[PDB]
Amino acid sequence: QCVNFTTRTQLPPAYTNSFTRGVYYPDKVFRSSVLHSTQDLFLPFFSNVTWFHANPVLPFNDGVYFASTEKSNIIRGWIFGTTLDSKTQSLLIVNNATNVVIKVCEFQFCNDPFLGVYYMESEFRVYSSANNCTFEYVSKNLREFVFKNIDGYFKIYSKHTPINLVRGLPQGFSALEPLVDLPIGINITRFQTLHISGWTAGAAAYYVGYLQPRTFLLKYNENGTITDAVDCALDPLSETKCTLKSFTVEKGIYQTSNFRVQPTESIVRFPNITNLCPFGEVFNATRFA
């Protein structure tokens, strides 16, 4: 139950420094006043984010740091999958006052999928067809999220933080806690955000990012809450902190690593050509027998 639309709200992607956001608890083990050096898929420090403002389709790749700013519970829906149709199993997430709503199966998404709100709200017309499936699950302000999918496990972390500055991302640190886990795996390649309500919304600023494998250095406090993190492969200073496993470094000289000049091309040779076979007489004989 959906139609097309006219006002293509296409806006160019602005850019802004990512700063030091996107740190989550990797393991559910308690630790106290230690610096456990770990490597994992993170959001590298000091990148820039594909800021958006109809809503485009984006690739999944490894992961996504889908942050979002909002006032009074704006963003609701999420669509994930490979082909985003009834041919391949798709995934749908709806967040609301309670924790999480999850449906996992093939749907029929049109060019204008939106949940719709009625003004006491009751409307559901994102797709049209739902053939069969098994798993469903039930349970000013910046709402940070993370969407990982590793070895048949889908993981969602979260955090909520009040903000006061209008535009830029905060210059602060806040770790992410594990919220939802699913023992289901699909080769997801794309995802899309859902639109709320014809629709009338242009001020929906949701940032996007990407995760890469690298190594960090987390610091746990006495209560086991991550309060600091140091990237390793960023600059010739953080490498010293990584290799010393300390946050303060004394005056001196420390050996970090070593480099090697890499090969460029190949010049494979062979002995100079000599002693051509006498095929000229055979192929240009006066008379064949």
Binding site: P236, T240, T248, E250, K251, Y254, T256, P271, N272
Partner: protein, 120 residues
């Protein structure tokens, strides 16, 4: 004769029947090309450790990078940084030479050492 390195111009002499020389412990050191019958030589392309000279995390957060025992011709994020300097110890990137004389704070090597004022 598989191998990696750089092929400069050699000035040795082969008797008319050899094909390639070597020096000690079975390491190739010269090859005569199979086509023009001239002798080149092989030198493996350089490697080496790196080191970081920092004046103290509390005092500052800018560092100088030392590439040990490497010619300052093919160094390459600190590809340029500050004024690149060459010394017997290696290529020093991020500090500028000073033609005065002080005491020694952080022994660098080969008769030179650095300190904090920038980094000299």
């Amino acid at each position: 004769l598989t191998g990696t390195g750089v092929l400069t111009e050699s000035n040795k002499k082969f008797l008319p029947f050899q094909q390639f020389g070597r020096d000690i412990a079975d390491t190739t050191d010269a090859v005569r090309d199979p086509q023009t019958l001239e002798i080149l030589d092989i030198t493996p392309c350089s490697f080496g450790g790196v080191s970081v000279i920092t004046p103290g995390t509390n005092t500052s957060n800018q560092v100088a990078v030392l590439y040990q025992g490497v010619n300052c011709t093919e160094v390459p994020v600190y590809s340029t940084g500050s004024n690149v300097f060459q010394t017997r110890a290696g290529c020093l990137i991020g500090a500028e030479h000073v033609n005065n004389s002080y005491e020694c704070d952080i022994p660098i090597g080969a008769g030179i050492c650095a300190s904090y004022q920038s980094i000299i």
